[model samples]
Target chain A: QPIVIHSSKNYGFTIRAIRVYVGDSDIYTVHHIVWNVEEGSPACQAGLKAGDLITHINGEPVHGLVHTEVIELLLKSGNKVSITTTPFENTETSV
Target chain B: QPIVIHSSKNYGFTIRAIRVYVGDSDIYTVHHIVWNVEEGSPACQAGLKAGDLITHINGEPVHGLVHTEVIELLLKSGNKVSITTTPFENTETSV
Candidate 1:
């Protein structure tokens, strides 16, 4: 028989990666951006790379939001969702 | 003259992102992976992506180590560093 794992709260999916901001003065790093996807998620199918800077999800701008909170929003919504992101790049300095 | 931001401890570079582990039983999320680079960092020149897992740094295994401690190691080392990472992937379940 297949085993099942249950969560007291809901089990939401998370993707982790790093964000680096290189400014003229200093560099800043924001380490968490845990956005959730649905069961058998379409987002997973879209090649939405993890650690990407998500500009929006389902028409919602996600800038300046905490990770857990973003997951909450995804959990609340049902049906199709749109996500926008700027691909992350490695570099010496911010342009 | 250019402004300088000073810290009592040395300023180590940090890159932040989320890490998602989808196990057969459950999922786990790990945030924060801050590593340091020198003045005119070669790592940046090497196209090391921010938010990369950094399986090793300077031949030291970083698995299960705390973020701040990893930064300390990076700061202590001089010259070339080698880092390895398993790229992040989004999926419905772990196989």
Candidate 2:
């Protein structure tokens, strides 16, 4: 689901992500995961939480994203950010 | 002036831009100039022309931009791109 949060440059949240090269070119793919959310923060109030797998930012797919790119996008988002995520499931304990 | 152009992924325009390093750090700035505009194309119809300086894309300032970043922004803009430009002036020739 997509969560729209309105905040300043400080998102009051953190992310853990990794970028990997794809098929032998400069092309890269990324997995952006929400790692932490400060209590009473904008993101937290908007239902953003740890373990959410971020798929999009402001309608743009999070592909080929590096750490700086993510930071830049969030900073440029101004007062609002629209994010889409997949709920993280702990399959190891589910069974 | 800002020229709002609604165009497909193919912008029907080309840009000649240069990125320069700022006061240390990873910070950079860019000057994006319209290098060409296909006749009767979307950009041309929108009043975009060669020599126009592109200052923003989709409302975000084109700062710290690399070649790929510009291309990515344009591709991700979907069917519409809001661009802000400063009219390029040939000072020596104009005077």
Candidate 3:
């Protein structure tokens, strides 16, 4: 239950909140990565399709960090930010 | 970039592998999940949508299984394949 940000450019298909949560920590941790990516979007264009697992952003481990903290880290990087992921399973991972 | 068609009933939709890979150790982690669950599939009916995250199936951790092995695991459940997921991000995640 952690999403919904867009200044009118929600894109082709919006990022719907993951339905379930996984893992232990308060983090949400969704069950699957690709809850379903829309047909067109920058995320999908860059190979960041749905069903992929995520762990690090900008080379930083997200599981060990706070949710709000990671959100800012992901959005604020500005222009260049890489993520480390596994197509395993897990979501939102709110804490 | 990992998927295909069907022979009979591909159902309402199909399973598209997660796009982005995350984590390490040769495991393919996707960037997001759901990759878009078709509108009327059984998967969609179970509260499972195109954005939920997945971790375990029938209480078994899938990260440890090989892609082919897991494929059969999911298919062989025979009437009962309970997948554990979260509404976060991640995907097919084959090993």
Candidate 4:
């Protein structure tokens, strides 16, 4: 089946990710971390976040090095990537 | 006098432009053109175009090797730069 995806803004290139679907159900996502936040942004505003694990963005699973590709998917979907667990939260909130 | 400007998108660098203020009254604008469009874009969609005497962007005079800088200004102001003429329209349009 062909999935329709559109470009979100212009980043000159595309980024990739891995997604797991179960019987037509989109399950998880994962992707490798590459770029870092330099200025004030959602990721920066949230807290000290880095490109780590990235198992999921807003509950969607991601995997791979195609950051642009993943971004396009996210933009087309109109959903924000929600980090289930933060590195700081994991260490600080873990019992 | 100095003016405040912000960066637009994450393009790695800043593009510059030339703004003319006549006794505090911003008058003309001009800038040199660089980086030709390869894919479909406003410049491309409108018609065949190229980087040649970018005297103005949306009527603002620009000068120098600073494309990123001008983009920043447009983004911060929430305005779109309008191209005055097309190179193709010039010699062909001119009598």
Candidate 5:
């Protein structure tokens, strides 16, 4: 997607996800984040973090969804996601 | 003086100027920028770019001045700089 980093009190952010091919099946592991959140932004206000993974948005399970799926889920919210997270290596904590 | 970056139409940009040390004199070159300008932002409207050097703000000669000086000068303008720029390699263009 189109991402830009700028100055001022309105500094922006990005969320990077790792799309891994797990043994060439329909097994794409998702990360859904990176170093793309402004330190004190709305995302930050929502507890956004570079290390967090997208587990669910609203009530949908996003863990194994493809990019288009996850993006659609998030974008369809219009506002930023009412989000929940976990680490890529963990699957138990889905909140 | 703080910086941030995020997503959406507000996706931002940064302006990184090369701050070089010329020998051991009071010579710290200024680069007033990086990839810190948000696309289509006010800063972007002001034509902020990554390679531009901060030469003057208002009508003062900002060349060879320290960070605090240039920053203060820019900040004092309330809005962004009424800027002029040049390549570090060329002193011919000013605007």
Candidate 6:
């Protein structure tokens, strides 16, 4: 199941993501993981928490996006941002 | 004289500002100076150039603001940003 969280430019959470390039191949993948969530912040109030796996930003999937591209998408969403995530507990196998 | 430049989150110029506090005194000042302007960018097209002294952001004077505050003001302006500046040639004496 997917959970949606709402926040703004002053994001109350920090993300830790990894971008990997396959050896001898042109394949690359990105995984955006929630690292920390500030207390009483919009993300916290919206049920966001650390370890959540961010799968989409503002309704756009970010499967092949780089770290910078993900940030750009979030910022380009303006003041109101919607992010979709899957619980890390459920997606840990894919990591 | 003041010149206004328009840009977005991808600001076409970099700033090199200084915040100073007088010792033993409660007086402080901030000088927001344009460090570099990308060629053909909105800032460049609008007559913005390196060494320009930024005096206002989005119509709010930033004389007593910190570096972070000025950036916040600019980011809060959303996609459309208006920055007012004085040519470095005119404000060199204040530095």
Best DockQ goes to which candidate? Answer: 1
Query: Candidate 6 at A66: error in angstroms?
Result: 0.7
Q: Which model is ahead, 1 or 4, in terms of lDDT?
A: 1
Model 4 scores a TM of 0.26
On residues A5-91, what C-alpha lDDT tens digit does candidate 1 reach at each position? 233344334644234434222354443433444454444445444445566666676666656656665566555445566544443
Candidate 2 stretches greater than 4 Å from native: A19-29, A89-95, B1-95
lDDT by residue (B1-95, candidate 2, tens digit) is 57878774566777655332322236634456565777667887898866466778888887667656776887888888888887432112211
Write one digit per residue (lDDT tens) for candidate 3, span B12-73: 32233333323222334332234445555556555555545445656776664434454565
Model 3 C-alpha lDDT per residue in residues A27-92, reported as the tens digit of each score: 343322333455445455555655444566667666655434655665676554465656442223
User: For every model in order, what is the number of clashing pairs?
Assistant: 10, 0, 75, 34, 33, 0
- CAPRI accuracy category, model 1: incorrect
C-alpha lDDT (0 to 100) for residue B90 of candidate 2: 19
| Top candidate when judged by TM-score against the true structure | 1
In angstroms, how far off is B86's CA in candidate 2? 55
**Tens-digit lDDT string for candidate 5 (A7-60):** 333334454444433322345434454334555566656655554456677777
TM-score of chain A of each: 0.51, 0.75, 0.51, 0.42, 0.59, 0.72
Higher-TM-score candidate of 1 and 5: 1
DockQ each? 0.13, 0.01, 0.07, 0.01, 0.01, 0.01
How would the docking of model 6 be graded? incorrect
Candidate 2: which docking quality band? incorrect
DockQ versus reference, model 5: 0.01
Write down the DockQ of candidate 1.
Answer: 0.13
Could you tell me which residue pairs clash in candidate 1? Answer: A16-B18, A16-B19, A17-B17, A17-B18, A18-B16, A18-B17, A18-B51, A19-B16, A31-B16, A31-B17
Which model scores highest in lDDT? Answer: 2
Least well predicted 10-residue stretch by lDDT in candidate 4 chain A: A85-94
